Amino acid sequence: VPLDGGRFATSDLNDLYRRVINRNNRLKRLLDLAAPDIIVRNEKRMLQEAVDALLDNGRRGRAITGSNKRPLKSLADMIKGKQGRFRQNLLGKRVDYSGRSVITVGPYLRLHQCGLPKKMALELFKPFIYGKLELRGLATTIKAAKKMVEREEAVVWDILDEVIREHPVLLNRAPTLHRLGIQAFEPVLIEGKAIQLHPLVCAAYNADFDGDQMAVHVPLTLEAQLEARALMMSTNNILSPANGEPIIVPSQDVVLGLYYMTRDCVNAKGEGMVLTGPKEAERLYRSGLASLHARVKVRITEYEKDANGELVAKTSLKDTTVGRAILWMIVPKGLPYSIVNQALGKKAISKMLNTCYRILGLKPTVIFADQIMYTGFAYAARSGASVGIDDMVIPEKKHEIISEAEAEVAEIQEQFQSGLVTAGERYNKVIDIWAAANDRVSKAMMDNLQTETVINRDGQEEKQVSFNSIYMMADSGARGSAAQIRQLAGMRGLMAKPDGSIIETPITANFREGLNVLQYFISTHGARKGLADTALKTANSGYLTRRLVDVA
Amino acid sequence: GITKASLATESFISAASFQETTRVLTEAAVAGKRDELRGLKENVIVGRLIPAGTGYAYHQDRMRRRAA
Amino acid sequence: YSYTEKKRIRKDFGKRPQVLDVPYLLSIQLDSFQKFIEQDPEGQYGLEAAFRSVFPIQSYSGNSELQYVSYRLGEPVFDVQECQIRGVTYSAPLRVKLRLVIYEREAPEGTVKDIKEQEVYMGEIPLMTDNGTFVINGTERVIVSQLHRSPGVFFDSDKGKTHSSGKVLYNARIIPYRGSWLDFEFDPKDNLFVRIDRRRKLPATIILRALNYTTEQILDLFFEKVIFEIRDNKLQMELVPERLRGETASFDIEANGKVYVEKGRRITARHIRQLEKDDVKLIEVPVEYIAGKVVAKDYIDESTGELICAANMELSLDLLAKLSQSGHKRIETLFTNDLDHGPYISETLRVDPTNDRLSALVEIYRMMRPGEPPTREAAESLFENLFFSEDRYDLSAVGRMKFNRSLLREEIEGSGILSKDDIIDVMKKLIDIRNGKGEVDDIDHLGNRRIRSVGEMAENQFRVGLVRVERAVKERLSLGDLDTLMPQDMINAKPISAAVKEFFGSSQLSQFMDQNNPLSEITHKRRISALGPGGLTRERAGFEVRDVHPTHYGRVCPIETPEGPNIGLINSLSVYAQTNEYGFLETPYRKVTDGVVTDEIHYLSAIEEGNYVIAQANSNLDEEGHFVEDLVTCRSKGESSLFSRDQVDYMDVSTQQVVSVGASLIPFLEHDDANRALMGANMQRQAVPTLRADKPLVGTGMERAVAVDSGVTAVAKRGGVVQYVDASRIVIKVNEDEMYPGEAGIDIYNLTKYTRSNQNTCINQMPCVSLGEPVERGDVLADGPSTDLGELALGQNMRVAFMPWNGYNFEDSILVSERVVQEDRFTTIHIQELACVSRDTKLGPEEITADIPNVGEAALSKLDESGIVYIGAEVTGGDILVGKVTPKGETQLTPEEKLLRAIFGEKASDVKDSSLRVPNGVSGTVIDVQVFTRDGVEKDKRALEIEEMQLKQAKKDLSEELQILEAGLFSRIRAVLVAGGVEAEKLDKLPRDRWLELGLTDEEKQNQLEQLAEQYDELKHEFEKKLEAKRRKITQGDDLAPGVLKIVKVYLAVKRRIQPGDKMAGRHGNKGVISKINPIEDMPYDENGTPVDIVLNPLGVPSRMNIGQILETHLGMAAKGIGDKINAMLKQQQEVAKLREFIQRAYDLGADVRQKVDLSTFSDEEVMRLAENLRKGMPIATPVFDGAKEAEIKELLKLGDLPTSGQIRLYDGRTGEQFERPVTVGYMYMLKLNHLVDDKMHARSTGSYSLVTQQPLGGKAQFGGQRFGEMEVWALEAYGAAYTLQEMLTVKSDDVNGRTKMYKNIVDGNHQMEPGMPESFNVLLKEIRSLGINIELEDE
Ligand SMILES: [Mg+2]
């Protein structure tokens, strides 16, 4: 085929076919001339190797290369491999009615809807708009309608708002590791260029908003639309298929807001009053007369399912907090008050959603999950939950733990100089007394971090769980482990060589203090090993998944 | 194993599309095999409804209006 | 201090004094290419070495020879800017003097008949620009340096990864610079095997017999002889005591006294030592002891003459009895034991089939050239040309050095080829390592890995082209045309041009220059790559080559590497790292002589570095130089430990010695996790230059170095006074101190204005200087993209609050204020180039015209009479930029449209509209139009007016520079005329030019006046011919591609404002995407009503442990808090005494900081200028690992009257009520990355399809479809979405008839598909049938 600049582009099969024809015609010529048989045998060998290179180039002998020193693509290479017919063109394809954009968060969205840019939707839904422009008489011809959509008249946006109305779109994030990597959403036309993804589905997609892109696909037929609505819609996808656990589950900001709301302070403002219900708790919190953590006595009416499907009420005064009473207002009816009368971490909220699903079903659960998201976002905003440098509280006895382990390592070093121990048990003793000192620093840090709110109850001091922000993020399951608070406020501990063997002097520093040049270098030793594992194991996991799919 | 079990299927199309396409097509050609398109990959290759899901009814009445 | 640096002084918090200045950052590229192209009087480097490698060329005769005299690089035809405009390589012609010397037929001397000596043109060499780039086909490219395995011999093993028994099998590998590889190795049965070019292994004694060694000579090479000097009886045997080390006691030893050790007791050291106390030489041995030993010689009889016993046969009672009838005095025997002297060479002589040199050469031939019957001459020449030919094998100077150094030889010079001794020593050292007397090499050691840079890779490719021309020159000299030809008739410049053209344009290491910002450019130029020709492949590079080796310290950054499939394969040079004369990375260290750390700096390589104990740079040391401590932390051997202060030999020269230039710019890097620091270093060089540059409030102090060592700024070459400043040029009147005699003394700096980078960003230079301002040498005169007063400014200083805001910063999202968008803080200019190419077609030439069919007068509103858009035209997507029509024919009207045109009489167009339009969604301004017309094509009115404008501009620029330069000359003349023989009022009485007619009394005065007159005449006649050179290069035709008649390049400038979806990031790996742009009254605000610019999530901080973004925030609030104070003093119009006092307080703050800023030295005008530059926040330097401590941050927060907690009380903009906890508010340096959502958003309903398979095309440039790959198909199969899947497979991609039916059905409101067969399945069926295979659909 002629290229744009008058040059031609060809397949390697034309080179291979031409070679077969040329050697075949020369063989016919030689058999006509009655050549010496050393020449005819050579031409027969050449015709054989030309036909072999045409069928499978590189099996027998060296691959024939043409004019690049790059081997020619034979007929067998057309159909085999990751770039053959099967895997590149038959088992997966490039499709029409498909777009792609960066995803952002919409925290206002409902679980079944996405935000779709108007510029993307105007292109993805273009024959639908042409049809509804010709149908409504706004265009006399599909070319008149095409010019209307090019000019983007004010009426094609009304036509677009009615063609997308009940029409789902499939949103896909690569890698599609499981079936929740494609989910269907009802589009809400937005003004950006970025797709607005619901927060609660991000864990299903393994998506964060740091530059991820997602593909949009438009189901065209009525069957595809009803499968998007009935099989693939995100409100059908709240349970995992791998394990029956909820996969549309609160995280990060939502669980921090719901945890901060359901916690209790000792002498919080408005402590010890008696409330007529959750609406009074919300009135007192919003008017500034009671704190979200004020432990309080609220008259709570909770409904339970009897032996039958009936929902019978019981009313009682619960010993609760103001924030737990406020959170009770979004809980559906068949659930007990004990589901919120505690500080709600990630596990408790996931179990609350699972309980709602098993007791009440899918329709209360999707409403509950949306309400949970809105409430957790609102009350994480209200909290002002920041991170500062004074939140990484380093234990005051960390320096003496390190000095004591240094004294122990010095006396073991002097024992090795005095021949009491060989190098092996000497090294293992050093490793052991540094792992023990690391555990001591970790325990001291967590003890100084987890309860160090000391608070006055009617004058008397009392210990309570800490409202430290680092600790609240770790304890709620929002972000962070104890193993990472150890690196922020404890010591970073023993590092491994690229060999895998432990360097015998640990990082006695944390990230609040600095690491010096040497500590940082021996930390990069394992940082790069982990990053190279992440980079090289996606191919192995993809190959294993491909083998599993193709066996099953 | 999952490679030798997926290469030993009764369908040469799915096995040839998985891997070792030359071996599969060679043994299927000299054996004169015939692929009845009963799995998901072979109906994906050929652009049909898969025999699972909402295409399960279609394949059922495709096979009971063929066995009758 | 300067004039450019006391404008705005960055407050340094670093405490360690700087002993070594950060070097010129682009020395790698510039030094390497200078070694390539410079005239080397010796033949060591570059083009000279390459020419001497092949010349003199001698034919297969004695008649003539072509020898090389000299070479010369001519002047480039176009300079670098003209090359970028015209799309051509910036290169210099290589003119080489050759001498064709003809010897006559018959003489014992072969003296000359004649010599025909002349200059041949062989190729153009691409020239490197002032900044380390090459312009190749118009685009700037960087030749990345290569980290490859050094040549030499390397001893390795596999550790139990063979033979299922955990046995370690050793090997040796001789790797030349150029030639065949030579591997020795051990099998699981301890036989030595040679293997040439990774082919099948032969026994290693075959290569020993290819060398002329007999089995006896081999056995004396690789063994030592146990002698049995047997007397009349009693089997006397020689013995040295250390030969029975650990010996199994086969017999009790009685000699020079009775038994030391009886049977059943193996020999320990006390026995050897008491036996040598007895000084025993001769021992009586039993007969069963020698049974099994291996004879070391050929013992033949003198009775019959033939062989009794050959060398390397296991001796027995029978054969000793045989030689006893022959009466041999001495019988030698190989000394072998277990674990100290192995039998491997003898056990290998037992396995090989060869018995002489011919058979060995023949076995090597059968291995190298199988199926070819070996003759003696070919078997001899194959081996002699494998490793022992200078033209086929080069173990280069670095390879000879590493070879000799690995074998513990004294000399490091040698031949480039192997010898018998080299191969024997390699085998002996492999045997040593097998016998426990050595250790295997670490091949990832940076003493084993070598840097190969552009000037060496270019030389290698030039030598490749030179041998490609050498074969043809040797072929031409063998012909009898020899007496009438010149040397330029036998030299073909095209192969030599092709070799260097292929290297510079098509290498993997010749990469499109990363031109986002200055940091991108100097990071690209300081990049090392393990990949490339002669390096690794990223697919088969294992885990261990991608690791941070201990030798990387100071030589390669452990942080800056990409995060994807090639991680640890692309590395970045460290700040101080330089390259050896051999190519090995070295790093500088301070010498510690007597415990006193000296300022004497030695550059140590990774081999040398391991010998010494090297203290850290975090090690404190007193005023005299001694360590204040006595137990210092050091690296001795690749380990790190504590040492006494008298054991240390060296010290690190800086705390930033270990990091690259990109990681040196991250403040509080020591508080960031290394993964997030890697991400921050990688994202800093994706930042896009914004409208106004904004210095970092929190920097590290490497900003000036980065901005100046890249060529983006205009830096003062000589000091002077700004004579004329203007947005496009700076004119400096050079100080008399820096002027040469006979010179105008005027420097002119022409600034780059609004050109596009490789990334379509804007490159624009703005002058820093004002009129009449004094400049010193090295001062920044104009800022480049992303520099602010000569400091690298990659982003903007944003007031951040760390708090969750209503889910809008959920999961790395970023909430941005609307004030950030009103104030154009992250608005970036992008410049697109769009080409309309008018070609000859077979139906006729395409025509650039404003007369376009089916296009109204409204769409041709901004086209001129030539059909090209006006400059300055605000265009949007779909607007015609260049109107073009293509001639077509044979419209072949459908009968319905034939009737349609019969009714309404409208003719059909003979041309089709092929115009250049703005891409959709893009809305910019036309800022430039270039028309390139072929010779013979007539220029339209637009090309003529563009060229008239170009000619007036060339004449105007040259007459302006001549006016400036002659004004400088005449100022100098007036100064030298009043310097002696004063005419002070007579000079203004004389006409201006005829001051040159004034004969002056010459002590030295008339000499200077006359060389000034000569300089003026030469300037005038230099302008006069530069004008005609410009005019001829403007009016000349363009060397367009074949078929192309003209090209019109339009340049669009697009201002991109920030919007939801744009990726923003900090320097600490805190990337994110803007989710919302919030109204200002909705943002959180403090007690004073100041809203926050950006709200970031605090939950991204503790799990991604980049704590440095919190500290940078706390310090950024402190820095700004200083400016907020200074600003107030500038609005209250306080005295200079108060401003001077407060700024001195602010600069004196810190715990023993290294910098001293004394403002008493500053004049009041200088203090006020400084205070005006510090009113937007005082900038602060926080050196990596030497930065501000948290107590100093709190002290500076206290100085600015801020809470030392870093956290303030915020209020909700929407409700007015407090957030219940204090919020960390401060200032973070945010960067706008080049992942803009305008470039990412793409959609398609229908479009173009591929040829062979009819599926949609790939990208958004092709308006392509999304890949619904295999895993998405599995996702749909896991749902029951069979109809969704069937329409993905058939009707959306490949079903050709079904997809148009589907379109028509959608348009008719009928959402039903009629799916057929995918077209790629029919392609598959036709391709399986093109094999011999009958694949068929059973249609029953
Ligand atoms: Mg991401």
The DSSP 8-state label assigned to residue C688 in this structure reads P
Identify the burial level of C335 via C-beta atoms within 10 angstroms of its C-beta, where 0-12 means exposed, 13-18 middle and 19 or more buried.
middle
Cα–Cα dist C193/C183, whole Å: 8
- Say how many Å lie between the CA of residue C1173 and the centre of ligand 1: 38
Respond yes or no on whether the N-terminal peptide bond of residue A175 is cis (omega within 30° of 0). Answer: yes
Q: Which residues contact C526 (CB under 8 A, 6 or more apart)?
A: C25, C26, C28, C572, C573, C660, C661
Cα–Cα dist A76/A73, whole Å: 8
Task: For domain C828-945+1047-1056, give the fold.
Answer: OB fold (Dihydrolipoamide Acetyltransferase, E2P) (2.40.50)
Cα–Cα dist C476/C490, whole Å: 7
3-state helix, strand, coil in chain A (%, to 5): 50, 15, 35
Asked if C761 and C829 touch (Cβ cutoff 8 Å), the reply is yes
Which 3 state secondary structure label does DSSP give A417?
helix
Resolution of the model in angstroms: 2.5
Q: Which of B6, B16, B22 sits opposite A86 (nearest CB)?
A: B16
Asked if B23 and B11 touch (Cβ cutoff 8 Å), the reply is no
CA-based nearest residue to C129, from C37, C192, C198 = C37
- A-chain CB neighbours of C1309 within 8 Å are 131-132, 135
User: How many helices and strands, by DSSP H and E, does chain C display?
Assistant: 33, 61
Which 3 state secondary structure label does DSSP give C834?
strand
What is the Cα C1117 distance to its own chain's centre?
A: 37
Q: Which of B25, B34, B55 sits opposite C1338 (nearest CB)?
A: B34
Compute the nearest-CA separation of B61 from chain C (Å): 15
Q: What length is written for chain B?
A: 68
Cα–Cα dist A451/A466, whole Å: 5
Identify the burial level of C262 via C-beta atoms within 10 angstroms of its C-beta, where 0-12 means exposed, 13-18 middle and 19 or more buried.
exposed
- A-chain CB neighbours of C1238 within 8 Å are 193
Closest residue in C to A521 (Cα) is C558
The DSSP annotation for C498-545 comes to HHHHHHHHH-SSEEE---SSHHHHHHHHTEEESBSTTSB-TTT--TTT
What is the b/e burial string over A442-466, where b = at least 16 CB atoms within 10 angstroms of the residue's CB? bebbbebbbeeeeeeeeeeeeebbb
Tell me phi and psi for residue C792, to 5 degrees: -70, 120
Cα–Cα dist C1285/C1292, whole Å: 10
For C243, the token pair is 């030969």
Q: Which residues contact C411 (CB under 8 A, 6 or more apart)?
A: C404
Which 3 state secondary structure label does DSSP give A47?
helix
CB atoms within 10 A of CB C593: 10
CB atoms within 10 A of CB A371: 15
The DSSP annotation for A476-520 comes to TTSS--HHHHHHHHS--B--B-TTSPBPSS-B---SSSPP-HHHH
Cα–Cα dist A60/C1289, whole Å: 37
Compute the nearest-CA separation of C879 from chain A (Å): 12
> Which residue(s) pair with A273 in the sheet?
none
> Which residue(s) pair with C1233 in the sheet?
C687
Identify the burial level of C582 via C-beta atoms within 10 angstroms of its C-beta, where 0-12 means exposed, 13-18 middle and 19 or more buried.
middle
**Degrees to nearest 5, angle at CA C855 with C850 and C861:** 55
Best mutation target, C1254, C1274, C1276, C1289, to test chain B (most B CBs within 10 A): C1289
Does B48 sit within 8 Å of C1285, measured CB to CB? no
> Which residue(s) pair with C1106 in the sheet?
C672
Place of tokens 């020591």: C670
- Say how many Å lie between the CA of residue A210 and the centre of ligand 1: 5
Cα–Cα dist C573/C556, whole Å: 5
CA atoms within 13 A on the CB side of C684: 33
For C304, the token pair is 């019959």
B30 touches chain A (CB under 8 A): no
Asked if A184 and A237 touch (Cβ cutoff 8 Å), the reply is no
CA-based nearest residue to C683, from C864, C927, C517, C470 = C517
CA-based nearest residue to A193, from C1094, C1264, C1240 = C1240
Does B54 sit within 8 Å of A223, measured CB to CB? yes
For C428, the token pair is 């002996």
Cα–Cα dist C578/C27, whole Å: 8
CA-based nearest residue to C666, from C1068, C1178, C1064 = C1068
The DSSP 8-state label assigned to residue C1102 in this structure reads H
Instruction: Using the Cα atoms of residue C1067, residue C1071, residue C1076 and residue C1082 in order, give the sign of their dihedral.
Output: negative
| Element holding C1045 (H helix, E strand) | strand C1044-1056
Does A550 sit within 8 Å of B14, measured CB to CB? yes
C854 touches chain A (CB under 8 A): no
CA atoms within 13 A on the CB side of C715: 18
CA atoms within 13 A on the CB side of A364: 16
Asked if A509 and C633 touch (Cβ cutoff 8 Å), the reply is no
Compute the nearest-CA separation of A110 from chain B (Å): 27
CA-based nearest residue to C1111, from C1209, C1193, C1170, C1171 = C1193
CA-based nearest residue to C655, from C672, C668, C646, C642 = C668
**Strand order through the sheet with C527-529:** C449-452, C145-149, C527-529, C570-572
CA-based nearest residue to C825, from C933, C689, C720 = C689
Rounded (10°) CA dihedral A546, A549, B1, B7: -90
> Which residue(s) pair with C847 in the sheet?
C885
Cα–Cα dist A449/A454, whole Å: 12
A55 touches chain B (CB under 8 A): no
Cα–Cα dist C853/C1065, whole Å: 49
C363 touches chain B (CB under 8 A): no
For C613, the token pair is 């104990």
Best mutation target, A206, A247, A387, to test chain C (most C CBs within 10 A): A387
- B-chain CB neighbours of A56 within 8 Å are 22
CB atoms within 10 A of CB C1: 10
Q: Which residues contact C289 (CB under 8 A, 6 or more apart)?
A: C250, C251
Which 3 state secondary structure label does DSSP give A185?
strand
A208 is in an annotated binding site: yes
C198: left (phi over 0), alpha (psi -120 to 50) or beta: left
* Antiparallel, parallel or unpaired: β C844-845 and C1063-1065: unpaired
Cα–Cα dist C15/C37, whole Å: 43
CA-based nearest residue to C909, from C863, C847, C860, C864 = C847
Respond yes or no on whether the N-terminal peptide bond of residue C562 is cis (omega within 30° of 0). Answer: no
CB atoms within 10 A of CB C759: 18
Asked if C545 and C360 touch (Cβ cutoff 8 Å), the reply is no
CB atoms within 10 A of CB C242: 10
B41 touches chain A (CB under 8 A): yes
CA-based nearest residue to A329, from A300, A360, A296 = A300
Q: Give the amino acid at A57.
A: N
How far is the CA of C40 from the CAs of C52, C93, C122, C459, in angstroms? 11, 18, 19, 13
A480 touches chain B (CB under 8 A): no
Q: Which residues contact C711 (CB under 8 A, 6 or more apart)?
A: C130, C131, C784
Cα–Cα dist C418/C407, whole Å: 13
Instruction: Using the Cα atoms of residue A322, residue A325, residue A329 and residue A330 in order, give the sign of their dihedral.
Output: positive
Q: What ranges make up the beta strands (E) of A279-396? A: 295-305, 311-321
Q: How many contacts, defined by CB atoms under 8 Å, are there between B and C?
A: 53
Asked if C1150 and C1228 touch (Cβ cutoff 8 Å), the reply is no
Cα–Cα dist A461/A454, whole Å: 6
Tell me phi and psi for residue C1107, to 5 degrees: -65, -20
Cα–Cα dist C828/C516, whole Å: 11
CA-based nearest residue to A328, from A346, A303, A347, A345 = A303
C1003: left (phi over 0), alpha (psi -120 to 50) or beta: alpha
- C-chain CB neighbours of A223 within 8 Å are 1283-1284
For C908, the token pair is 């059909």
Does A547 sit within 8 Å of B21, measured CB to CB? no
Cα–Cα dist C520/C710, whole Å: 10
| Element holding C123 (H helix, E strand) | strand C112-126
Cα–Cα dist C96/C117, whole Å: 10
C1075 touches chain A (CB under 8 A): yes
Which 3 state secondary structure label does DSSP give C1024?
helix
What is the Cα A58 distance to its own chain's centre?
A: 43
Identify the burial level of A470 via C-beta atoms within 10 angstroms of its C-beta, where 0-12 means exposed, 13-18 middle and 19 or more buried.
buried
Does C1107 sit within 8 Å of A488, measured CB to CB? yes
A210 is in an annotated binding site: yes
Best mutation target, B14, B18, B23, B58, to test chain A (most A CBs within 10 A): B18
Asked if C426 and C5 touch (Cβ cutoff 8 Å), the reply is no
| Element holding C32 (H helix, E strand) | helix C27-37
Q: Which residues contact C427 (CB under 8 A, 6 or more apart)?
A: C172, C184, C192, C204, C208, C222
Does C1320 sit within 8 Å of A85, measured CB to CB? yes
CA atoms within 13 A on the CB side of C1273: 31
Cα–Cα dist C786/C771, whole Å: 23
For B68, the token pair is 């009758």
Rounded (10°) CA dihedral C393, C397, C403, C406: -160
Place of tokens 């890779």: C457
Cα–Cα dist C704/C8, whole Å: 12
Cα–Cα dist C253/B14, whole Å: 78
Q: Which residues contact C566 (CB under 8 A, 6 or more apart)?
A: C531, C538, C541
Tell me phi and psi for residue C862, to 5 degrees: -105, 20
A91 touches chain B (CB under 8 A): yes
Q: Which residues contact C1310 (CB under 8 A, 6 or more apart)?
A: none
B45 touches chain A (CB under 8 A): yes
DSSP alpha helix (H) spans, C783-884: 819-822
Does C1280 sit within 8 Å of B56, measured CB to CB? yes
Q: What ranges make up the beta strands (E) of C1098-1205? A: 1180-1181
Q: How many contacts, defined by CB atoms under 8 Å, are there between A and B?
A: 37
- B-chain CB neighbours of C1333 within 8 Å are 25, 29
CA-based nearest residue to C767, from C782, C751, C752 = C782
- Say how many Å lie between the CA of residue A103 and the centre of ligand 1: 10
The DSSP annotation for A84-137 comes to SHIIIIISSEEESSEEEEEEEE-SS--TTEEEEEHHHHHHHTHHHHHHHHHHTT
Cα–Cα dist C613/C645, whole Å: 10
Does A91 sit within 8 Å of B41, measured CB to CB? yes
Q: What length is written for chain A?
A: 552
For C434, the token pair is 């097998």
Alpha-carbon Rg for chain B, nearest whole angstrom, is 13
Chain A neighbours (≥3 Cβ pairs under 8 A) are B, C
Q: Which residues contact C1242 (CB under 8 A, 6 or more apart)?
A: A99, A100, A101, C1260, C1263
Cα–Cα dist C827/C821, whole Å: 8
Tell me phi and psi for residue C136, to 5 degrees: -125, 115
Does B44 sit within 8 Å of C1285, measured CB to CB? yes
Does B44 sit within 8 Å of A91, measured CB to CB? yes
Q: Give the amino acid at C1162.
A: F
Place of tokens 């690209």: C524
Q: What length is written for chain C?
A: 1340
- Say how many Å lie between the CA of residue A528 and the centre of ligand 1: 19
How many angstroms separate the most distant Cα atoms in chain C? 136
What is the Cα C719 distance to its own chain's centre?
A: 34
C123: left (phi over 0), alpha (psi -120 to 50) or beta: left
Instruction: Using the Cα atoms of residue C1095, residue C1097, residue C1098 and residue C1100 in order, give the sign of their dihedral.
Output: negative
Q: Which of A132, A199, A216 sits opposite C807 (nearest CB)?
A: A199
Cα–Cα dist C1183/C1168, whole Å: 27
Does B22 sit within 8 Å of A90, measured CB to CB? no
Does C1266 sit within 8 Å of A94, measured CB to CB? yes
